Amino acid sequence: KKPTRTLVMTSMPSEKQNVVIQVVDKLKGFSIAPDVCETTTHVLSGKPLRTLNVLLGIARGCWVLSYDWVLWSLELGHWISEEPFELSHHFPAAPLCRSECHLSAGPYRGTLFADQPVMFVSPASSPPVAKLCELVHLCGGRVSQVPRQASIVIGPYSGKKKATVKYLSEKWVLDSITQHKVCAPENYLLS
């Protein structure tokens, strides 16, 4: 055998899904994972939307392309160049992490949240906490299992608020990932 790298599909109608599976079957060279993981190198969107799988792809520096790249890859009979079809306009961070991952010295880990405090992610947050903690780690940030260690809290938090802590929304994390820019914390405050 099975090709190691994996090709994931998001916002992808079923009629389009079968086409992809079948271009992978004829052209070989990939394995299809249901979710972006360690092996994923390419992510294909049917409709450019910010799904869990597009966020994660941006964190890993994967190619994030339009369904077009498959159509033409089929018409030609080989995996063509990815660059012409990656969704720069919708996710301006993708092209940055993509290039950054391919010129990486050692293995690739984002540096985005590296100069940030330790964050605690609440379990009752949406998206799910497991994937949203993963996002923060993949991007450079460090997460804590208990709030007392964290200087930043993320998501629904009922407990006594803390003056030495900034309590923010999830979209602060997500928007910083999409813009490849640590957004201003003062306009992502969760109250």
Binding site: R50, T51, S126
Partner: peptide, 4 residues
Amino acid sequence: SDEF
């Protein structure tokens, strides 16, 4: 797949 939920958007975010």
